Design a protein around this ligand. Structure first.
Ligand SMILES: NCc1cccc(N)c1
Length: 330
């Protein structure tokens, strides 16, 4: 089998992407944030504290003839931005772009933190990291990809995120019309539960490529590109007036600037992020200070190839017995 679904930016900055997902019988369609940096499929629901729902579409398990309470199971998750959610668990039928999994763990939120409430466009998350990170207790649950894998034509999914435009998540096949050139594959460590790999270096604008190993994760659920302070300083030094602001929480730059591109290495290959992808707009409405899309990972403990980087590529998440990542230009 295969599946194919369009993923759409939630706003004009590409702050996140939502993909429609059918849950239950009859189908209830929720718009979920596919997140290769976490491993829980959780949704706003009829069980979510009413004051914490503000415009999201909810899953109502009592209206699904295929929903079954997973007795005793609870979940609780915290993300790198300080947000969190928790609740109980149902199993139900879940379909993405025509690909159906029966018996998928659907984690129903009883509580969500303020950032989730305040974002009416995201009805939940669909985790696509390794199932070892799934938070369900006392019986850990499998991701949608792990459950679908055996049925797929090939044990892969691909992320093709758009810049200020819709893109595609495919399951079970590689669309050879969706990228240019060849796909370069690189090794993955699953030791921390992430799609963790080592970039071979970087360049800023038209500058020379610096060969240096940068271990990080491919994370569709993180907006920006978080890299070591040395690398990030070298980038922003090429932008007149750019500076790191403690009060704002990262590098800012004059909105009148034209940003240089940023290149990262995948083996001997190179992915070029155009400068415009690095512009996240005014720090507050009407400001002439703009927020940068490349930020330091120093306070995080890990480097993160988030959407800023991934949207410049066609990305293969290869879930073969030994997982690997593939990157192509597009
Ligand atoms: N990085 C996971 C994620 C995705 C969407 C929203 C939040 N708060 C967190």
């Amino acid at each position: 089998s295969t599946g194919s679904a369009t993923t759409t930016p939630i706003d004009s900055l590409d702050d996140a992407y939502i993909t429609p997902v059918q849950i239950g019988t009859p189908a209830q369609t929720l718009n979920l944030d596919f997140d290769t940096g976490s491993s829980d499929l959780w949704v706003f629901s009829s069980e979510t504290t009413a004051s914490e729902v503000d415009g999201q579409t909810i899953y109502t398990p009592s209206k699904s003839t295929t929903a079954k309470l997973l007795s005793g199971a609870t979940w609780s998750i915290s993300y790198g931005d300080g947000s969190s959610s928790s609740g109980d668990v149902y199993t139900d039928t879940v379909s993405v772009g025509g690909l159906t999994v029966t018996g998928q763990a659907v984690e129903s939120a009883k509580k969500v933190s303020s950032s989730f409430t305040e974002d009416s466009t995201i009805d939940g998350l669909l985790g696509l990291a390794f199932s070892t990170l799934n938070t369900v207790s006392p019986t850990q649950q499998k991701t949608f990809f792990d459950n679908a894998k055996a049925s797929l034509d090939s044990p892969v999914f691909t992320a093709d995120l758009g810049y200020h435009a819709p893109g595609t998540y495919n399951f079970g096949f590689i669309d050879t019309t969706a990228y240019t050139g060849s796909i370069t594959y690189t090794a993955v460590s699953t030791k921390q539960g992430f799609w963790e790999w080592t970039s071979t270096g970087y360049a800023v604008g038209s500058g020379t490529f610096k060969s240096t190993s940068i271990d990080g994760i491919a994370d569709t659920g993180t907006t920006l590109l978080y890299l070591p302070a040395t690398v990030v300083s070298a980038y922003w030094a090429q932008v007149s007036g750019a500076k790191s602001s403690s009060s704002v929480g990262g590098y800012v730059f004059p909105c009148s600037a034209t940003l240089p591109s940023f290149t990262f290495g995948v083996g001997s290959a190179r992915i070029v992020i155009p400068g415009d992808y690095i512009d996240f707009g005014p720090i507050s409405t009407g400001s002439s200070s703009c927020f940068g899309g490349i930020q330091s990972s120093a306070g995080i403990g890990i480097n993160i190839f988030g959407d800023v980087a991934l949207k410049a590529a066609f990305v293969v998440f290869n879930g073969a017995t030994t997982p690997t990542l593939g990157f192509a230009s597009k």
